[PDB]
Structure formats: structure tokens, C-alpha cells
């Protein structure tokens, strides 16, 4: 007979354990990019010197070798980088084969096929499908996180704490991220396939899923219903008829399942910690290390001047004028990755916010914003830095407004009241870790005021 494959053993439990994907409740082969996996492939006979094997992997509806959503690679004796297959051993008709993906591979579901050239004939046969995720264990991955204990918290932990209350009195709630529960990883991959980007141009969306910046920004849009029938419909009205009270959720799992099982119709209703809880589940699943941030006295700046503006007339009466506001607290997310777009100094934590506050490029989406950038007030960089800088470090300015002459002038400044007790759960405990000093220089330093001026300088290029 011509050479043909009889069976393939994916060594699923072995490879999943090596790829730190073994925790997911799922039968599938789940792998991380840039890391080899080993399979046993039982042929009908031994390989001839006339005979060739070629593997073909593809992802998404319009695979392309140029877009790196398709790869064709021969079984060889040498690793090439890129996609490769290395023959490690022959034993009878069984081939032991080590297959490697590149660190730059797009994440998602892949199909693998084998093409055999034998006796002047050609056969092709689907071997199977796998899921490829980001690889925080791999030094050359953009999402690389070198510390073991932090990786465990920010990738592998499926229970969380979210800080709530006020700047007088901080509480906490638990949140079940549940990224390992049945179907949740599948649903989180779904989200990418339902984005406006995917609908406009699936070939390019899928090619862009090698970039955590891209995936992160997309998720920040798609977790909210606005624009795209994403996951959660916001409601701050106090009246939640025809839905759940935002406070009754205690995890992401029901929300994501209910979204799928309603035919991908917005789940009613969420507020900011519910968006953030759900976004966190998505990020951890896909392998972007992430965590949940609470900012107390969080500024909503609606006119890009880095100040919350309050108005009085010259006789001292309060004016109903201006749209700026200050939240008791607001919850968002950080994701961990390099920023090849910005440069070496701006890697690490990046703000992502799914709560629909301001349109960014026409869409309710937010981030990624370099937390380092924000602290140094480089608010000309992508993405959404002015808005986020105001959230944590707006001045609160009282204005005098003389309605006769249309003149407003500045009465007073409070440069320290915004952005207090910025909080994330501690690694490996339920302690509140304070990360205020990561977002800004210390209130009342010279640096803090220098950056504030610098930042303000860059709004006006």
C-alpha cells in the first residue's frame, strides 16, 4: 500500500501538563504558542526515502501563509524556528514527532492536516484540531511573565477578590472568574469571532490575534453590549426589571454561559465590577496575565483637560453646568505584556476597561494604556491615556462663570483628592495590595506636579 497514517496519539494529558493548560475542564488539546508538543503517529508502514510528509495548520475562515494563519511544513530532522516537525524516533511503523509553533502565532482554534507524497501519489488527511493560547511561561512571548508565583495568581487562579465601597471605607466581594469551567474557554474564543473587527474583515482580525494589544482592546469592546451585542448590558438606574440586579452575580461563568445560550444576546445587567470580572475571565483564559483594579474617587473627565470641573457663579451659587463626575470607586483591569508599539520602557501592566464610559475611535472600548506611561504622564501615547490619567490624577477645579460675559476663570484647585487607594488582590492571599504609587508620583511631590503640567502639555500638541 502507499504510505498512509493509521492513527495519531496526541498525548493530550502529557502535552497539556507541559503546556500548563491541564486545568481546563475540556477534552481538547490545548497548547501554548512557541512551545513544542510531541505526538505519536502510527503509519501503515515504515517511511521510504521517496516518501514525504507535510503538515498543514490553519486557523480562522480565510487562512493565508502570508498572514501567518496558515503554515505548511515538512517533517524534517532539523528545527527551523517557525512551525516545524522533527522526527525524533522510529519504532516499527510508529513515528515520534515533535511539532513546534512560533511565539508570534495567532491564538485560537487550529486544524492540522497531513499531506503524504507516496509512489507518485498524493493524499491529505485531517489529523485533528487544537487550541493555541498565549504563553506567559515562554521568555520570548510578548505576554511573558518570569515570576512563578505571580504567574500562578495572574493566569492560573480562578477565584478573585474585588475591592468596593468608598474612600472612607473599603469593602471586598469575591468573584468566581471560573476560566477552567466547562465551555468557558470556548465561549471566550467566541467573543473574538463576533467583534466588529471580525465582521468587517475576518482575515485580518484573525491574523492580528498574535498581538495581545489587539486581543485586549477587542475584549474591552466586546465585553460590553454597546455597539456590537457584546456580553453585558450596563444599567446604573436602580431599576433592573427584565434582568438580574448587577449585585446578584458572583462570577463570570453564568454570565458567559447565559450570553452564549441566549444566542449571543446581551446579558442584563452589569455595573463596573461585573464588566471587569468578566473581562478578567476572558484574559486569563486566553493566557494574558491579568488582574482587577479598583480606583476610589475616580474621575470621569468628559472634555479632555485632566480636570474635573465644577462651576459657581460669582455670587457663590452652584451652577448646573458641565458633565464631569467623580465615582465613589470604579473598577477596571490590567493585562501584562510588552508594548512593541511604544518601546521597551512602556511594557508591563496595561489598563483595559470594558465599562462603557467614553467612545474611543467611535467605539465603547478602552486601552491598552501603559501604566508606566500614565505615571510619567506620556498621555500622547496610545491608547486612551488622557481619559485614564484623569481617572487617577485629575485635578478638581472650581470655576467661576459669569454668564453675562461668558467668561470663566479658575477659583481653586484640589490636586490630591482624585485617585485614592488604588487596589488589587494580593498574590496568594485576600490582602488588599495598594498600587496607587504605580499610577502616579506621590501626591504633594514636585514630580507629581511636573508630570501633571507635562501631561497637560501633550493634550495640546
Amino acid at each position, epitope marked *: 500500500a502507499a504510505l498512509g497514517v493509521q492513527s495519531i496519539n496526541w498525548q493530550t494529558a502529557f502535552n497539556r501538563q507541559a503546556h500548563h493548560t491541564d486545568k481546563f475542564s475540556s477534552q481538547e488539546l490545548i497548547l501554548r504558542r512557541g512551545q513544542n508538543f510531541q505526538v505519536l503517529m502510527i503509519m501503515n508502514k515504515g517511511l521510504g526515502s521517496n516518501e514525504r510528509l507535510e503538515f498543514i495548520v490553519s486557523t480562522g475562515p480565510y487562512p493565508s501563509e502570508s498572514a501567518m494563519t496558515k503554515a505548511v511544513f515538512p517533517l524534517s530532522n532539523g528545527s527551523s524556528g517557525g512551525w516545524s516537525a522533527v522526527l525524533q524516533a522510529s519504532n516499527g511503523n510508529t513515528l515520534t514527532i515533535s511539532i513546534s509553533s512560533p511565539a508570534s502565532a495567532p491564538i485560537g482554534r487550529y486544524t492540522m492536516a497531513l499531506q503524504i507524497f507516496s509512489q507518485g501519489g498524493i493524499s491529505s488527511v485531517k489529523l485533528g484540531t487544537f487550541i493555541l493560547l498565549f504563553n506567559p511561561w515562554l521568555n520570548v512571548d510578548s505576554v511573558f511573565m518570569g515570576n512563578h508565583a505571580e504567574r500562578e495568581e495572574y493566569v492560573q487562579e480562578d477565584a478573585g477578590i474585588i475591592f468596593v465601597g468608598s474612600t472612607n471605607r473599603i469593602g471586598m466581594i469575591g468573584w468566581n472568574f471560573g476560566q477552567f469551567e466547562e465551555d468557558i474557554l470556548s465561549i471566550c474564543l467566541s467573543i473574538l469571532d463576533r467583534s466588529l473587527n471580525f465582521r468587517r474583515d475576518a482575515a485580518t482580525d484573525v491574523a492580528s490575534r498574535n498581538d495581545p494589544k489587539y486581543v485586549g482592546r477587542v475584549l474591552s469592546a466586546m465585553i460590553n453590549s454597546n455597539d456590537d451585542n457584546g456580553v453585558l448590558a450596563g444599567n446604573w438606574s436602580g431599576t433592573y426589571t427584565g434582568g438580574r440586579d448587577p449585585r446578584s452575580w458572583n462570577g463570570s461563568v453564568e454570565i458567559l454561559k447565559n450570553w452564549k445560550k441566549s444566542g449571543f444576546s446581551p446579558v442584563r445587567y452589569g455595573q463596573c465590577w461585573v464588566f471587569a470580572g468578566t473581562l478578567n475571565t476572558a484574559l486569563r483564559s486566553l493566557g494574558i496575565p491579568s488582574r482587577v483594579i479598583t480606583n476610589f474617587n475616580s474621575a470621569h473627565d468628559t472634555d479632555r483637560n485632566l480636570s474635573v470641573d465644577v462651576y459657581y457663579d*460669582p*455670587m457663590g*451659587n452652584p451652577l448646573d*453646568k458641565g458633565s464631569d463626575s467623580v465615582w465613589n470607586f470604579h473598577v477596571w483591569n490590567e493585562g501584562w505584556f510588552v508594548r512593541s508599539d511604544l518601546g521597551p520602557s512602556y511594557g508591563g501592566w496595561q489598563v483595559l476597561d470594558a465599562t462603557p464610559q467614553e467612545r474611543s475611535q467611535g467605539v465603547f472600548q478602552c486601552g491598552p494604556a501603559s501604566v508606566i506611561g500614565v505615571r510619567e504622564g506620556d498621555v500622547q501615547l496610545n491608547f486612551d491615556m488622557p481619559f485614564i490619567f484623569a481617572e487617577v490624577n485629575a485635578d478638581r477645579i472650581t470655576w*467661576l462663570y459669569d*454668564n*453675562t460675559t461668558g*467668561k470663566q*476663570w479658575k477659583n481653586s484647585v484640589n490636586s490630591h483628592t482624585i485617585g485614592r487607594y488604588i487596589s488589587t488582590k494580593a498574590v496568594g492571599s485576600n490582602a488588599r495590595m495598594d498600587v496607587t504609587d504605580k499610577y502616579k508620583y506621590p501626591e504633594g511631590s514636585d514630580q507629581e506636579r511636573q508630570v501633571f503640567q507635562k501631561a497637560l502639555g501633550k493634550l495640546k500638541p
Partner: antibody
Framework: QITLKESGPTLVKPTQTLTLTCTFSGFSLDTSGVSVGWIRQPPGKALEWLALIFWDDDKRYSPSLKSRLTITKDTSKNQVVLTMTNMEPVDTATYYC??????????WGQGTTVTVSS | DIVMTQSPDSLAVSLGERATINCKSSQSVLYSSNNKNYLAWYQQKPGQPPKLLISWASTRESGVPDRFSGSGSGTDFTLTISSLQAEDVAVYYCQQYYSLWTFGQGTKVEIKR
């Protein structure tokens, strides 16, 4: 003690520039929130607001006459100066200056008569 | 420009009697934000500059006798002299200061005798 006092030429030939001075006391035009304004009144007619200057050198003008008007201050001399170009017989009027704070124009000067004629 | 139109143009009343003056503005001078009417009344006795009687439609200035009282809101205002005195003879202007300054045309108030 808030008093304002106007001065300048009481005759101007057409096309020329009237220049009026307001000398005030009882209050500072360095105080925040304070403004002094100019108003004129053509004989047996209604009052017409001309211009206004604030403590910080912000100016306002009658929209119709803006292109012709220029208001300036000298806090050292306790003076506000009004300049009106291209004077014409219609511009014959009594000219006033007045103090403003937090309501309207609340204390006025005596007024000075200005006749436009060759 | 907001246009201030007073009425009547002239009034003659006996000593002690009530004299009323309407003023109407082309737009509303009620600022909702502070719920204040940006509307003044002045008195000009012949040969003097004008003198402010009333701000914010209804607040009397210091020293103004209580026989003077302002009412109205929005675009309709009234100055009412409760007991006309010989020396109250003057021209009364309304003025809006909601959008810059515009005056009414004036109303002459004279003693009937």
C-alpha cells in the same frame, strides 16, 4: 467711596478718533472679579453699552461697534481708556464709565458730553 | 441682542398713588442654572447719570425706599412705585444683563397735579 470720573475732548472732527479716560477711586481694578464698563447716551435717547474691561485685561465690546472700539486700563494711574475710531455726528452723546462686580453696572460717573463736528 | 421694550412710554399719577411700568424682553433672561433673572431697573433724574434701583428683578439696592418694588420673571417684569413722591419724577429704564447689556427705551413718570 466708589467714584468714577470721565474726561477727554468735548469736540471731535469727523473721521478722527475720540479718546476718553475714566479715573476711579474706592476700589481696585487689580481685585479679582471686578470690571469697569463704558456707556453712552445720545441726546434725549436710550442708554447704549459700549465696552467692558476685567481686572485681568479681558475685554468685551458691543457686537455692532466692536471693530471701532478699543478699551485699555492702567491700574497704576487708576484709569480706563476708551478709543473710538471714525467718529461721526451720530456719535454725539454723553459718555459714562461705571463699576461692575457681581451684579450689573452699579455705580456710574458724572458723564462727559462729546460733540462730533467739523 | 436681547431687545428690551418698556410700556407705557409716559405715565402721570397723583401723589401717593401707584405707578406701574412693564418691561418685556425679546428672550428669556432667566438663567435656569442658578434660577436668577438677570434684569435691573434704573432711575435717571434729569441732568444726572442713572441710578440703580433693583437687581435680579426683585432685590432692592442699598438705600432704595421700599415704595420701589420689582416683580416678574423670564421675559415679563414690572417696576411698581407704591406711593409716588414729588421727587420720584424721572425716567426709568429696565436693563437686561443676561447677555451683555441692553436697555429699554425709558418711561417718563410725572406727577399729576
Amino acid at each position: 467711596q466708589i467714584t468714577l470720573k470721565e474726561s477727554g475732548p468735548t469736540l471731535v472732527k469727523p473721521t478722527q478718533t475720540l479718546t476718553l479716560t475714566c479715573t476711579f477711586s474706592g476700589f481696585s481694578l487689580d481685585t479679582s472679579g471686578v470690571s469697569v464698563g463704558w456707556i453712552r447716551q445720545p441726546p434725549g435717547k436710550a442708554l447704549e453699552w459700549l465696552a467692558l474691561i476685567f481686572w485681568d485685561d479681558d475685554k468685551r465690546y458691543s457686537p455692532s461697534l466692536k471693530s471701532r472700539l478699543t478699551i485699555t486700563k492702567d491700574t497704576s494711574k487708576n484709569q480706563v481708556v476708551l478709543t473710538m475710531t471714525n467718529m461721526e455726528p451720530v456719535d454725539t452723546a454723553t459718555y459714562y464709565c461705571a463699576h461692575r462686580f457681581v451684579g450689573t453696572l452699579d455705580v456710574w460717573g458724572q458723564g462727559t458730553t462729546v460733540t462730533v463736528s467739523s | 441682542d436681547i431687545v428690551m421694550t418698556q410700556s407705557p412710554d409716559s405715565l402721570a399719577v397723583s401723589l401717593g398713588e401707584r405707578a406701574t411700568i412693564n418691561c418685556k424682553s425679546s428672550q428669556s433672561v432667566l438663567y435656569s442654572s442658578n434660577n436668577k433673572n438677570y434684569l435691573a431697573w434704573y432711575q435717571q433724574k434729569p441732568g444726572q447719570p442713572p441710578k440703580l434701583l433693583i437687581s435680579w428683578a426683585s432685590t432692592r439696592e442699598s438705600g432704595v425706599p421700599d415704595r420701589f418694588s420689582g416683580s416678574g420673571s423670564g421675559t415679563d417684569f414690572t417696576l411698581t412705585i407704591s406711593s409716588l413722591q414729588a421727587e420720584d419724577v424721572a425716567v426709568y429704564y429696565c436693563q437686561q444683563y443676561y447677555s451683555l447689556w441692553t436697555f429699554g427705551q425709558g418711561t417718563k413718570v410725572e406727577i399729576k397735579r
